[PDB]
């Protein structure tokens, strides 16, 4: 009645669906500032806002469900089209499941050890004649009838069964699909509880990418940052031995001794104490400890403070900051490097920005005409469009070159200006 | 596309070149329509071969949802890669682009 | 219109001194070193806002006894058991903290969730004080370079 | 300093050869040449 008719609408606005889906989550989490304890909902406004909250807590959820619908349209089988194209051409060139039988790894690939026999095998890729083609590539060698058989209302039992199961088993192994599925499970709890249900707001980390500059400026460098954490841990694991063996009188979290005077004379206790305090110190661990004013080991105590005062507070702060700002310069230089190499000499011939603009206003047009990279794609549409019975020799020729999957015809260093004088 | 190839293979004329400026207006109407690429068609040298651009398909290409994936792909290929299959990567990139425009036609 | 108010009032009339931002251009190196990069700096403000909008859920659901701006309880003991109140409190205090939010809060000395409290302090101690400070500084010095 | 030094070393390895050391572009004037020009014409372990 409306089924596949409206189906185009969902991917047709799926990005805008996603935008309004994340747009709701602000006003979801916005109202929880108007809370009061027990859990009380304050409305210092037109008091029907709480019933509209009761509305929107499931309205956002069915919006997210519609987002998964439009995604299930959109960024679905093209990925498995790629996967299927890959495994088809790799069994074609290689016969991996026939001759090679790959290892315990590539669970993605070993998942396709169960799609080999499947009936409508390129169900959205190209053609199934390639199966018979590679039978003729290999079945006379090893097993002709063996490997071919190894390949192969009223909708009552007329379905792809195990091919569909394989398809789903690939489908689960997606980042963004699982991201949005997790987002759906996040939006589940409006019917359950807003304990964590208003905490959808992680989705800004994949909604706008403007912020992802910063997150990437962290995340490539974090592999050393965990080691910074480790060295912090071990240097304080060192420091907690010292006064524990030598200044337990200088331990005092006591309320001036007349109370049950508190000193961490256990290694773990003073360790966690330095972790809680001496990390968050700022002014030094000598701030939150017994000062000496005449101790035998007073200068030892002082020098212990000084070594802390430097080696924690100065050093590791500066370490993390300098890591971050060299990460800044790294990422900026990488970005503009990419920009320059695009804006130098061409991609295709790739000879000289100066060289095809030796004649003025040439090189950009030399790009836009002699290389014009989308036009080669257009040309492939042109070739895959028409029939080889009507190809010219160039057309049939490069068609066959592509059929060979060879790609020699592209201009290395040999453009038209380069061709002549 | 014939006479432009005559212009391209033979510039530096007069009688052709006055015929090249004779009456050329649909010529200028014809420039979403013709593709001019540059290959080596086993001539052991360049070949500037031309062809038609189906402008309906080209309009189907004209949306984004791909152009940022294009520029992404640009960053990918200038970023790293085996430097010979980068054209092959472009082939696969085009094939998926075909798949995208094919699936976005029916909208 | 700035100079109008000498006949009116020197409430804001002596505040003409913004004009140094267009008088000498020697200073405009610094202001440009800010102003091209501020388009991300407003996003730094936004991420600050939302991470503390996260943090104000936590103890509000779990450590309201560890809330105490009380003057030792015998007074009308003050604990922000409203989400907006403790949110603005972290905004006022935990932003301006330096030593951590565990400084200006109930320490634990035997709580069931004492280690949860401690790890909450630690995560604050890093993720605010270290991180966002370093973010703004590194933004500024890559802007320099 | 240290990052620039490291990537500098990386570039100078990945430029022109160690042995002849002429042009990364130059032995890849012919396509797919220079890496094979390394791997065959210079192939430094082979001298060992
Ligand atoms: C079936 N099929 C093909 O076989 C094909 C193709 N492009 C290249 N080939 C070879 N496309 C787009 C295609 O649909
Ligand atoms: Ca023919
Ligand atoms: Zn080129
Ligand atoms: Zn050499």
- B53 CB within 8 Å of a chain A CB: yes
CB contact under 8 A, B48 and A411: no
Under an 8 Å CB criterion, which residues of C touch A?
40, 43-44, 47, 50, 53-54, 57, 60-61, 64, 81-84, 87, 98-100, 102-103, 118, 121-122, 125, 130, 133-135, 137-139, 141-142, 145
* CB environment B53-84: b (16+ within 10 A), e (fewer): bbeebbebbeeeebeeebeebbeebbeeeeee
Q: Looking at CA atoms only, how far is residue A281 from chain B in angstroms?
A: 43
Assess whether the C-beta atom of A388 lies below 6 angstroms from ligand 1. no
**Torsion sign across C-alpha atoms B65, B71, B77, B80:** negative
CB nearest to A12's CB, from B46, B92, B107: B107
CA of B95 to the centre of ligand 1 (A): 8
Per-residue burial over A288-304, b if 16 or more Cβ lie within 10 Å, else e, is: bbbebeeeeeeebbeeb
* Alpha-carbon gap, residue C108 to C117, rounded angstroms: 7
- For atom 4 of ligand 1, the residue with the nearest CA is A126
| Gap sites in chain A (C to N > 2.5 Å), preceding residue numbers | 37, 152
Query: CB within 8 A of A220, min separation 6: which ones?
Result: A327, A330, A331
Distance of alpha carbon C102 from alpha carbon C114, whole angstroms: 12
Distance CA A377, CA B95 (A): 8
Report CA C20 to chain centroid distance, whole Å.
Answer: 28
φ, ψ at A243 (rounded to 5°)? -70, -25
Q: Is C6 exposed, middle or buried (0-12, 13-18, 19+ CB in 10 A)?
A: exposed
CA distance A89 to chain B (A): 12
| Resolution of the model in angstroms | 4.5
Cβ contacts of A217 on chain C, cutoff 8 Å: 138
**Do residues C2 and C15 make contact, with C-beta atoms less than 8 angstroms apart?**
yes
Rounded to the nearest angstrom, the minimum Cα separation between A412 and chain D is 7
Question: 60-99 in A: which are within 8 Å (CB) of B?
Answer: 78, 81-82, 85
Determine if ligand 1 sits within 6 Å of the CB of residue B34: no
Contact B49/A394, CB-based, under 8 Å?
Answer: yes
The dihedrals phi and psi of B39, each to the nearest 5 degrees, come to: -125, 175
Q: How far is C18 from chain A (nearest CA, A)?
A: 31
Query: What's the distance, Cα to Cα, between the start and end of chain C in Å?
Result: 39
A126 pocket-lining for ligand 1 (C-beta < 6 Å): yes
CA angle C105–C110–C112, rounded 5-degree value: 90
d(Cα B29, Cα B4) in Å, to the nearest integer?
13
Chain D residues within 8 Å of chain A (Cβ atoms):
3, 29-31
The closest of B11, B9, B107, B19 to B63, measured between CA atoms, is B107
CB-CB contact of A280 with C121 (8 Å): yes
Using the mean position of ligand 3's atoms as its centre, give its distance from the Cα of residue A373 in Å. 9
Q: Do D3 and A412 touch (CB under 8 A)?
A: no
Nearest chain C alpha carbon to A316:
C130
Suggest the residue from C50, C57, C102, C122 to mutate for an interface test with chain A (most A CBs closer than 10 A).
Answer: C57
**Which residue's C-alpha comes closest to atom 11 of ligand 1?**
A126
């Amino acid at each position: 009645a409306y089924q596949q008719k409206l189906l185009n609408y969902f991917a047709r606005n799926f990005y805008n669906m996603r935008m309004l889906a994340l747009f709701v989550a602000f006003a979801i989490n916005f109202i929880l500032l108007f809370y009061k304890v027990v859990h009380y909902v304050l409305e210092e406004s037109s008091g029907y806002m709480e019933p509209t909250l009761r509305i929107l807590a499931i309205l956002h959820t069915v919006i997210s469900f519609f987002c998964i619908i439009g995604y299930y349209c959109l960024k679905v089988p093209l990925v498995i089209f790629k996967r299927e194209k890959e495994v088809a051409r790799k069994l074609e060139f290689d016969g991996l499941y026939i001759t090679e039988q790959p290892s315990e790894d590539d669970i993605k690939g070993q998942w396709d050890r169960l799609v080999i026999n499947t009936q409508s095998f390129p169900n959205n890729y190209w053609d199934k004649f390639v199966k018979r083609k590679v039978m003729d590539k290999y079945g006379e060698f090893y097993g002709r009838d063996r490997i071919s058989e190894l390949l192969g209302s009223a909708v009552l039992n007329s379905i792809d069964v195990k091919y569909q199961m394989w398809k789903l088993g690939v489908v689960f192994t997606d980042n963004s699909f699982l991201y949005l599925a997790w987002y759906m499970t996040m939006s589940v709890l409006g019917h359950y509880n807003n304990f964590f249900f208003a905490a959808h707001l992680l989705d800004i980390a994949m909604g706008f990418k403007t912020l992802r500059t910063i997150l990437s400026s962290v995340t490539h460098n974090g592999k050393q940052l965990v080691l910074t954490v480790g060295l912090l841990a071990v240097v304080v694991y060192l420091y907690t031995v010292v006064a524990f063996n030598f200044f337990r009188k200088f331990y005092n979290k006591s309320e001036d001794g007349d109370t049950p005077d508190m000193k961490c004379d256990d290694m773990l206790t003073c360790y966690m104490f330095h972790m809680y305090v001496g990390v968050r110190a700022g002014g030094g661990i000598g701030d939150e400890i017994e000062d000496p004013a005449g101790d035998e080991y007073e200068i030892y105590r002082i020098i212990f403070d000084i070594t802390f005062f430097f080696f924690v507070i100065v050093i590791l702060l500066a370490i993390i900051q300098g890591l971050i700002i060299d990460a800044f310069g790294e990422l900026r230089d990488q970005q503009e490097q990419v920009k320059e190499d695009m804006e130098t000499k061409c991609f295709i011939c790739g000879i000289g920005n100066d060289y095809f603009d030796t004649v003025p206003h040439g090189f950009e047009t030399h790009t836009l005409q002699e290389h014009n990279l989308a036009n080669y794609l257009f040309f492939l549409m042109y070739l895959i469009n028409k029939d080889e019975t009507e190809h010219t020799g160039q057309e049939s020729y490069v068609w066959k070159m592509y059929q060979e999957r060879c790609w020699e015809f592209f201009p290395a260093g040999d453009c038209f200006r380069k061709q002549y004088e | 596309v014939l006479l432009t190839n005559l212009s391209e293979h033979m510039p530096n004329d007069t009688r052709l070149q006055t015929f090249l400026e004779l009456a050329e207006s649909v010529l200028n109407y014809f420039q979403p329509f013709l593709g001019r690429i540059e290959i080596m068609g086993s001539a052991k040298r360049i070949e500037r071969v031309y062809f038609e651009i189906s402008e309906s398909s080209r309009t189907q290409w004209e949306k984004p949802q791909v152009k940022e994936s294009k520029r992404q792909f640009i960053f990918d290929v200038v970023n790293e890669g085996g430097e010979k299959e980068k054209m092959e990567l472009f082939v696969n990139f085009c094939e998926d682009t075909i798949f995208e425009m094919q699936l976005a036609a029916q909208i």
